Curated annotation (Swiss-Prot):
PANTHER family: ARSENICAL-RESISTANCE PROTEIN 2-RELATED, M-PHASE INDUCER PHOSPHATASE DUAL SPECIFICITY PHOSPHATASE CDC25
Protein name stated in the entry: Dual specificity phosphatase Cdc25
Organism: Arabidopsis thaliana
EC number: 3.1.3.48, 1.20.4.1
Coiled coil start-end: none
Gene that encodes the chain: CDC25
GO MF term (any one): protein tyrosine phosphatase activity
């Protein structure tokens, strides 16, 4: 009942009605190497030494088709922080949002970490969306 107007999270099913196409990707920030501590799937984690040199980078590579999901887990608390930095860059430039549509994942990888063994293991490089 009125809860889907850009800049919002989507439930497991909410992903069905949309599922635009590969144009979607999940952004994460913390260090990447310090977050996984092993392997992983989907969503790419990045630094934050600039906080603005990462969204100009994404803005420069909008690729036209672009859907962005932030956090990678379930916005347990950092989600708002994700938007916080979004504001930081947008503050540096203005009306940034290199992404066509920004939303937050309902599951991300909370089930895997929380109730799906520690973290992805395997022994490959391109294993899953993002495995470090
Ligand atoms: Zn893996």
């Amino acid at each position: 009942m009125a809860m889907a107007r850009s800049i919002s999270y989507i439930t497991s099913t909410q992903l069905l009605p949309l599922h635009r196409r590969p144009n979607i990707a999940i952004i994460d920030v913390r260090d990447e190497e310090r977050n996984y501590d092993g392997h992983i799937a989907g969503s790419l984690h990045y630094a934050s030494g600039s906080f603005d040199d990462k969204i100009s980078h994404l803005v420069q590579n909008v690729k036209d088709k672009d859907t962005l999901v932030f956090h990678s887990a379930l916005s347990q608390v950092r989600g708002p922080t994700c938007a916080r930095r979004l504001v930081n860059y947008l503050d540096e430039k203005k009306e940034d949002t290199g992404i066509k549509n920004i939303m937050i994942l309902e599951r991300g990888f909370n089930g895997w970490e929380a109730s799906g063994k520690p973290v992805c293991r395997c022994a490959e490089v391109p294993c899953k969306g993002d495995c470090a």
